[PDB]
Write a protein that binds this ligand. Sequence first.
Ligand SMILES: O=C1NC=C(F)[C@H](O)N1
Ligand SMILES: O=C1NC=C(F)[C@H](O)N1
Ligand SMILES: [Fe+3]
Ligand SMILES: [Fe+3]
Lengths: 423, 423
Amino acid sequence: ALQTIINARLPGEEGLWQIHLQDGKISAIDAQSGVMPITENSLDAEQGLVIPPFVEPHIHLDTTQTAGQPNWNQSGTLFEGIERWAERKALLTHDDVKQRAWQTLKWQIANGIQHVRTHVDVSDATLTALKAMLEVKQEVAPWIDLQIVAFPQEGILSYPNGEALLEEALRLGADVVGAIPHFEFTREYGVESLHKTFALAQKYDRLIDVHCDEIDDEQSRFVETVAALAHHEGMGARVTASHTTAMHSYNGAYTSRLFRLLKMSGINFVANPLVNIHLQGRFDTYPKRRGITRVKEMLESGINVCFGHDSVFDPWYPLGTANMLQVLHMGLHVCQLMGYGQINDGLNLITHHSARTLNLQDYGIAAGNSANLIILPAENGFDALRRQVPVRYSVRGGKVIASTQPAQTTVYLEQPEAIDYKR
Amino acid sequence: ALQTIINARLPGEEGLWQIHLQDGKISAIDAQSGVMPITENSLDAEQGLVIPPFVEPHIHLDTTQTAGQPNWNQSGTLFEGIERWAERKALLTHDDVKQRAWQTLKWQIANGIQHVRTHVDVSDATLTALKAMLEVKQEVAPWIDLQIVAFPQEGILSYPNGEALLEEALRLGADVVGAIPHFEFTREYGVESLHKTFALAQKYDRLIDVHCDEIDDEQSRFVETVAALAHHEGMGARVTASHTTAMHSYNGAYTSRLFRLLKMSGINFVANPLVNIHLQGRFDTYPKRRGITRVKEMLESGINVCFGHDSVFDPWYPLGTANMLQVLHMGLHVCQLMGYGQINDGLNLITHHSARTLNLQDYGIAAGNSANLIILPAENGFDALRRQVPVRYSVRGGKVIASTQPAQTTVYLEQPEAIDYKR
Ligand SMILES: O=C1NC=C(F)[C@H](O)N1
Ligand SMILES: O=C1NC=C(F)[C@H](O)N1
Ligand SMILES: [Fe+3]
Ligand SMILES: [Fe+3]
C-alpha cells in the first residue's frame, strides 16, 4: 500500500511537501528542501498540486441524463424546467434512476470528486427516485460520500401532502431537509414553509439546504428568514441557502443591511454558475443581467460561499461532464473574480468552502485525517484553472481510485514539438 | 425682573408687538402702532423677530462628540455608523456620557433651543448612557426640557434581551419608546417589533418615536404599520416616525395611497437634513438620490413634519454646532422648498411643528403660557434664514438665559463702512 505522497505543492504554501500515510490516514506532513526520489510505495506528485478532494455541493442525480425526455425546455427557464421535469418524473422507475445516477457519479469519481450532495425530488407520493438514491448512496460509498437532500420541488404547502412526504423522506434516511419558498403559491406560504423545514431539521437532527430565491425578483427575500431562523436556533453551520440569485437584483442598501445577518448567522451559500447564467436573465430583453448571487461581496465579507454544477444534461442544463474546474471557470468570469489572486484562490470555492457547506468532519490535508486527496498536474490554482487540467490521481483511504494519463499534443514544425500550453 | 418685550415682530403678523410678562408667564400681547421707547425692565427686540424657542426633535446626546473614536465611519453609511458606535459603546463610562452630553447641550442653550428629544441607545445590558442621561435631564432642567427616547439601536427582536432592556429603560424613566424596524433581521421581526413598541407605550403611558425606514429600500414600508397602529389606538399625537428616508424611493401610486393613512393617523414626522444628505444615496453611483423624506408633499397635505440635527460630531456626522437655522437651510435646499414663502415659513419646521412632535403643552407666544421665547436680529423668517443670524436673546421663565452680541464687520474703502449683509 502507498506510504507517501512526495514532491507535492500545497495552496498558499511555498516549496515542496511530503505527505506520510499510515493505516488509511495522513500521519504527518513534512516540508522538503528539494525534489525527493521516487521509490516503491511512494506516489510522486511531480511538483503538481495536492489538495483535498473536489466537492459537488449541489447536483440533481435523480434528473441527470434526462434532457429532452419526453420534451425539451424551450424557454430555458426554471419554471418550464420544472414542468418538463414533472413530465419525466411520471415515467420514473427504480432502475432508471439508479443507472443514470451511477453514470454521472462515475464521471464525478473520474473528476476527483469524493463528496456529493444530491437533491432528490420528494414531491412524489411514490418516492421512486428517493428509494433508488438511498441504494445508490450505499453502493457508491467506497468512492463517494453521498448526501441526499429531500427536495420538495413543487413546494411544501403548495403540493398535496407536501409536508407529510418531506417528513417521510427524512424517516427513510434523507440527510438534509430542502425547501423552495419562491415556488410556493404565496409569500406567506414561503415563510411558513421555512418554519416547517427548520422544525423538521431539529426534530430529526438533519442539515438544511434551501433552493432559495432562485428567481430574478427583487422582492424575493426568503434568504433573510433562512438566516434568521438559523441564528435563532444556533445552527448556522448546518444550514445552506442554494442559489439566492434574486440577490443579484436587490438594491444595495437592503443588501448591506442583510449582510450583517448573513455573517452573524454563519449559514452557507451555494452559487451554480453554469445553470445560473443559463436560467437567469431570461425575462430581460437587453441589457440582460448575469443573475449569479453576490459571490465577490460574500468572499470580501468572510461569508462562506461555494460553487455547484447543479445539473448534468437535464431539464435545467443541456451540457456538462460534472467537472468542477469548469464550473469554477464560469463563476470566475461571470462574477468578475478575475484578479490573479482571486483566480488562484478560486480552488477554495470547489474544495474547502464546499466541505464546510456539507458540514464535513474529515476533510483536508492534515495529520489525523483520512488519506483522501487528489493530485492536479499544475503549479497552483491559477495554472490548474487556466489549463483546465484533469485529475492525475485521486486517492481515497490511501488507495488510488482514479487516474488520468494526460493527453499528448504535438505540432510538426521544422521539427516535432510537444505542446503543454504552459509559460 | 423683565416686565415687557417691546418692538417685536411676529411671524405671519403685520407691524410691531409688545409682550407683557408677569410671574414668569406671558400675561398679554398687544399691538403697537409705532416704535416704543426702551426703559428699565423692558427687553427691546429692536424690530427683530420674536418666536417661541427653537426645538431639537431628534439628537443623539449619548454619541455626541465621539466621531473617530476608536475608528472613523469610512463609508459614510448608517450601517457602518452603527458598527463604529458599537465599538465606542463598549468604552462608555458614566462621566464620559455626562460630559459630552453637557457640551452639546450648552451649544444648544446658546442657540436658543429650550426643548430637546435625545435618543439613547438601550441595546446595552449595563444601560450606562441611559443612567447618565437621566441625571443630565435633571441637571439641565432650568434651561432645557429634555425628553429621553429608549432607543434599541441594535433591534428589539434581533438583540439579546432587547425587549426586556427596552422595558427596563421605561421603568427607569425614559419618556419615549423607540424602535428600528428596518434594522431587525427580518420584515416579520420589524412588524412584530412595532406591535411590542406600541404595547409598551400604552402600558406605561409614554410617547413613541421610531427610527423608521432609514434606508434607501423601496420595500421598507414600516411607516404604514406605525401609522395604522397609532390610528387603531387613537394616539397619533403621541407618535413620531423619524427619518422615513425610504419614502424618497417609493413609487408615487403607493405613496398617494399611504398619504391618506398618514393624514388620518395624525402621527408626526422628523426629517434630519444634514445627516440624511450624507448617509443616504451611498449605494447609488450616478445619478445619486437625495434621500430625504417627502417633506414638501407632507406640508402640502397638512401632515406635521419638522427637522432635527440628529448627530453632532459622532459616527453618523462629522460636523455641526447644533444650529437649527443651519439644519433648516440644508433642508430647504435639498427638499427644494425655495419659493419665498416656503423659505419664510421655514421657521415652522424648527419651532411649532417640532413642539407638536414632542407633544408639548406649554409652547408658543400666547397669554397664559410660560415666558419662554427667543429674539432673532432679523425682519422675518426669510431674513433670519438667509443671513444665518444668531439668537440675540433667549428668555426662559421671563429671564434671560443666553445672549449673543453680534459680530461687527467693517470694510475699509475710501472710508470705513459697516457691512450687515442686509438689503
Ligand atoms: O428548483 C430547481 N430544480 C432543479 C434545478 F436544477 C434548479 O437548481 N432548481
Ligand atoms: O439608527 C440611527 N442611529 C444614529 C443616527 F444618527 C441615525 O439617526 N440613525
Ligand atoms: Fe438545484
Ligand atoms: Fe437618529
